[PDB]
Each structure stands twice: as C-alpha cells, then as structure tokens.
Design a binder for these strands. Structure first.
Length: 102
DNA sequence: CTCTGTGTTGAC
DNA sequence: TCAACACAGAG
C-alpha cells in the first residue's frame, strides 16, 4: 500500500498510480503538475530546472552540453510562472512549436 | 463526487 | 534542498 518511489529527481508518486512533479526554490516547493507517465513528470522537472537554474543544471534526461539553443530562447523569453503554468497545463510543447513558427 | 497538491516533518 | 505521507479542500 506504500507508494512507489521514482528513479528521477523531482518526481513523486500520486496515490492513483500517477506521478507528480515538484521543484524547490528557496524554502518553497513549486508543484509542476500530475502526469500519467513517470517519464513525463521527469521531463517536466527537467524543463523547470533549466528555467529556474540555467543551462548547466542537473537533469533527469538532458545533456548539460547545449548552452544556447531554441529551448534556452523560449525559456528565457518567458517568466518562471509562465513555464510552471505551461507544465501544469501540459501545453509546453504546443507553445514551443507555435513560438518557433517564427 | 474525484483526486490534486498542500501541510508537515525529517533525513541530508 | 529534497521526498514521504496524510488528507484538507480545490475542481
């Protein structure tokens, strides 16, 4: 009945078998949403930590070796709140697509 | 009604 | 900074 833990950083079990994501900023936990797939929570955490802590931060799936790309552009052109809301609303990929329609 | 995500606590 | 766990209260 104890919930399963995640290999990945910032990912927690949700009681229904789903997964939640969270980033810590100072003393405060910032919820990043809930997700059906553990990998999806992990990816959301990666996006959030690149926006909160920069291109050289430790990710679940990301390189650390790409300093200046379109993702850094899209993240820098948006507030922290807007990225968190995109992740919680599952709209990040769509917004990034329409952004680089430029 | 369902079930997120906040409150809280304790390791590190 | 971080997650584990219970369950207030958001939707």
């Amino acid at each position: 009945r104890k919930l399963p833990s995640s290999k990945y950083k910032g990912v927690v079990p949700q009681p229904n078998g789903r997964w939640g994501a969270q980033i810590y900023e100072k003393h405060q936990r910032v919820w990043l949403g809930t997700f059906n797939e553990e990998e999806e929570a992990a990816s959301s955490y990666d996006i959030a930590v690149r926006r909160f802590r920069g291109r050289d931060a430790v990710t679940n799936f990301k390189s650390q070796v790409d300093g200046n790309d379109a993702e850094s552009a899209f993240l820098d052109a948006h507030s922290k709140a807007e990225i968190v809301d995109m992740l919680r609303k599952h709209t990040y990929a769509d917004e990034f697509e329409q952004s680089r329609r430029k």
